[PDB]
Amino acid sequence: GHMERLLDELTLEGVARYMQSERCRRVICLVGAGISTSAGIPDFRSPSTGLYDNLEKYHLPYPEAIFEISYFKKHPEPFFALAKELYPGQFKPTICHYFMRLLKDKGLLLRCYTQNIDTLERIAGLEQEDLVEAHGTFYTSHCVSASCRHEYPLSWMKEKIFSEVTPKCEDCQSLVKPDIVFFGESLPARFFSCMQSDFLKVDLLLVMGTSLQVQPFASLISKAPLSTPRLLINKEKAGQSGMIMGLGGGMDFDSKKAYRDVAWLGECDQGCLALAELLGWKKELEDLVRREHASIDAQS
Amino acid sequence: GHMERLLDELTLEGVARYMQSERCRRVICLVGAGISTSAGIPDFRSPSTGLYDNLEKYHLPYPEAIFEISYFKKHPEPFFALAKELYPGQFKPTICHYFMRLLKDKGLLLRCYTQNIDTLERIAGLEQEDLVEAHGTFYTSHCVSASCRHEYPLSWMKEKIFSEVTPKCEDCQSLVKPDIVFFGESLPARFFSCMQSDFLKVDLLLVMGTSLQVQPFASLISKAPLSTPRLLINKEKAGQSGMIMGLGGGMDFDSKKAYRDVAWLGECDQGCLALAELLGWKKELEDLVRREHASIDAQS
Numbered sequence: 001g002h003m004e005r006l007l008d009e010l011t012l013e014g015v016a017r018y019m020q021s022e023r024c025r026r027v028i029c030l031v032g033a034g035i036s037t038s039a040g041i042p043d044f045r046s047p048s049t050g051l052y053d054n055l056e057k058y059h060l061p062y063p064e065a066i067f068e069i070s071y072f073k074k075h076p077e078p079f080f081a082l083a084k085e086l087y088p089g090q091f092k093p094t095i096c097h098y099f100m101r102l103l104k105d106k107g108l109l110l111r112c113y114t115q116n117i118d119t120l121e122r123i124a125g126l127e128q129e130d131l132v133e134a135h136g137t138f139y140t141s142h143c144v145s146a147s148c149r150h151e152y153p154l155s156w157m158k159e160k161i162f163s164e165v166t167p168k169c170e171d172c173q174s175l176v177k178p179d180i181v182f183f184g185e186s187l188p189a190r191f192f193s194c195m196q197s198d199f200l201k202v203d204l205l206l207v208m209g210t211s212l213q214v215q216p217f218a219s220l221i222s223k224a225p226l227s228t229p230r231l232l233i234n235k236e237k238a239g240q241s242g243m244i245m246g247l248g249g250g251m252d253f254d255s256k257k258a259y260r261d262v263a264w265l266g267e268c269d270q271g272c273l274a275l276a277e278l279l280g281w282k283k284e285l286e287d288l289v290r291r292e293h294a295s296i297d298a299q300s
Numbered sequence: 301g302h303m304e305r306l307l308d309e310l311t312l313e314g315v316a317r318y319m320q321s322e323r324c325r326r327v328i329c330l331v332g333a334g335i336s337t338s339a340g341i342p343d344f345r346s347p348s349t350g351l352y353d354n355l356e357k358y359h360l361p362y363p364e365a366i367f368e369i370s371y372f373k374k375h376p377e378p379f380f381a382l383a384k385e386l387y388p389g390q391f392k393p394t395i396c397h398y399f400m401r402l403l404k405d406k407g408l409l410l411r412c413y414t415q416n417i418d419t420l421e422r423i424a425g426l427e428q429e430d431l432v433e434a435h436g437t438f439y440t441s442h443c444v445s446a447s448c449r450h451e452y453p454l455s456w457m458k459e460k461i462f463s464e465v466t467p468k469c470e471d472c473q474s475l476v477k478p479d480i481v482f483f484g485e486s487l488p489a490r491f492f493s494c495m496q497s498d499f500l501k502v503d504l505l506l507v508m509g510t511s512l513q514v515q516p517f518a519s520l521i522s523k524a525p526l527s528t529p530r531l532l533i534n535k536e537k538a539g540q541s542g543m544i545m546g547l548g549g550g551m552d553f554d555s556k557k558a559y560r561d562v563a564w565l566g567e568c569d570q571g572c573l574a575l576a577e578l579l580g581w582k583k584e585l586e587d588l589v590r591r592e593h594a595s596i597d598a599q600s
């Protein structure tokens with residue numbers, strides 16, 4: 001026999017009918033750089049953006065040094081010069097971000113796991129307890145001295161970045177680092193406690209704008225229950241992997257045993273708008289996006 | 301420029317010279333089913349063993365149910381019948397197991413992470429603090445009742461398995477389950493605390509007898525520092541993956557930018573014997589294996 005098939009069809013339409021059923025109570029979103037590209041934030045981890053060409057001016061010992069905590073702590077100037085160069089010109093969350101805001105407000109969002117450091121999930125109205133920032137965030141920064149750990153808001157860090165003043169702690173004069181996770185740093189215990197709890201409870205996994213190549217994200221889709229449907233909204237297929245019954249396995253969109261995974265291929269905004277339309281949420285979403293973007297524009 | 305290359309050559313000979321240098325102080329072993337196949341324990345997660353054919357007699361609702369905690373707790377009889385059928389006829393650790401014992405005794409072993417549930421690492425002389433059992437172990441079993449959690453040794457569980465008596469707790473009559481991790485169960489917090497600490501400290505990763513397909517193992521090789529050499533001893537290449545500078549990346553044995561990863565293709569015993577020989581440990585290892593196997597044979 002076969003385990004229950006919660007999707008009636010392996011399509012967006014099937015996912016939408018499942019989302020409207022009684023069974024679909026707790027949704028986890030896994031989101032990456034693809035949900036912020038339409039907001040004008042390039043994927044720094046992509047080869048196509050050409051960050052290798054970006055780094056030559058700083059004269060690093062090797063190009064990977066920009067991501068490493070040991071190098072940062074001794075020579076922070078390249079990081080902060082790069083951060084100025086890459087600082088987004090505006091912070092308008094995308095349709096995809098506001099789709100997650102609707103999930104929150106409808107009580108469907110168990111958690112949003114994000115690979116992004118841009119804070120747009122928070123600007124869109126997701127709160128701290130809704131979020132697991134898998135690579136940290138620019139939202140807060142801390143003094144790197146263990147005895148101090150003075151916390152600084154993004155407004156403080158922004159001024160330092162734009163004025164090209166290396167941020168130093170006002171209490172102890174140590175370096176102040178954004179709460180993004182450099183190579184050589186550990187994730188908080190919260191990441192793993194959330195992850196172990198959340199993935200026992202998930203009724204639907206929405207994977208949006210991520211190739212699922214980079215850890216810790218690349219481990220997450222296999223933690224869902226075996227019958228929990230998984231929808232990918234992304235430009236290309238991702239997360240596909242010889243194991244018994246495809247267990248300990250990635251996505252199976254296309255084999256003859258495929259029973260729960262769906263790939264919708266295109267831009268995340270377009271995918272989320274199509275999904276919202278199926279759910280009867282298109283007007284709510286478009287109205288939400290309009291008023292929120294307007295509120296941001298009203299403060300310029 | 302390029303980060304330091306701790307291996308002078310991408311060969312076993314290069315790894316051995318590195319192991320003998322001052323820099324190589326802390327070794328992590330990541331081991332899987334391939335280190336116990338020569339001891340007569342097949343890889344149950346492999347398609348080649350044909351566990352699908354093994355399960356038909358038990359009349360499960362679906363074949364994946366044998367691995368799921370919810371099904372076990374309601375219908376434990378298939379699991380225990382299967383466990384009898386798969387119970388190893390002997391427990392002689394392999395040359396590979398005893399290679400890790402040498403690393404322990406020489407003070408080089410930071411940790412052994414194992415995918416195996418067979419207890420052979422413990423029989424070989426690795427202690428609890430040396431080990432992270434990524435899929436748990438048969439070594440201990442527990443009453444499944446949260447209010448009780450009575451612990452039972454393997455000798456107790458073995459008698460129950462062979463006599464075909466479903467193990468019940470002597471205090472409360474709930475089911476007693478081996479400490480192997482079923483689908484729907486969480487890993488201990490120790491796994492993640494060890495993992496975050498260990499992988500900041502690792503000077504050499506020895507990956508032996510694992511395809512690195514199944515989580516949580518599939519996330520571990522990317523947590524090592526970027527300059528830490530990684531040796532694979534396995535029948536075929538594994539852990540190979542478009543990301544900037546191959547970051548957030550699997551093994552790079554074969555590209556033109558390969559700088560730290562080595563694949564030795566063959567049986568784990570043969571690989572470990574060859575590595576030991578390079579290190580001047582062949583006699584020590586062969587003597588260790590002989591006396592330990594003899595000690596086991598002396599108790600038959």
Ligand SMILES: Cc1cc(C)nc(SCC(=O)Nc2ncc(Cc3cccc(OCc4cn(Cc5ccccc5)nn4)c3)s2)n1
Binds near residue numbers: 083
């Ligand atoms: C509010 C605000 C301010 C600013 C300045 N930007 C942004 S969004 C735009 C952006 O790309 N900005 C960047 N500013 C510095 C960057 C370099 C860097 C250095 C160290 C760790 C780090 O991010 C955390 C990490 C590290 N890794 C590891 C790994 C894996 C695979 C490939 C590359 C890196 N992934 N995520 C990043 S990228 N948002």
Ligand SMILES: Cc1cc(C)nc(SCC(=O)Nc2ncc(Cc3cccc(OCc4cn(Cc5ccccc5)nn4)c3)s2)n1
Binds near residue numbers: 243248366387388417
């Ligand atoms: C001391 C002793 C006693 C006995 C009886 N055997 C052994 S070694 C031989 C052997 O294969 N025995 C087995 N006895 C029952 C088995 C079935 C089963 C049921 C549930 C979880 C579990 O192991 C833990 C897990 C679960 N997963 C998940 C996943 C991922 C990918 C493919 C298949 C399973 N990986 N490891 C395993 S396999 N050693």
Ligand SMILES: [Zn+2]
Binds near residue numbers: 145
């Ligand atoms: Zn301070």
Ligand SMILES: [Zn+2]
Binds near residue numbers: 443469
């Ligand atoms: Zn009990």
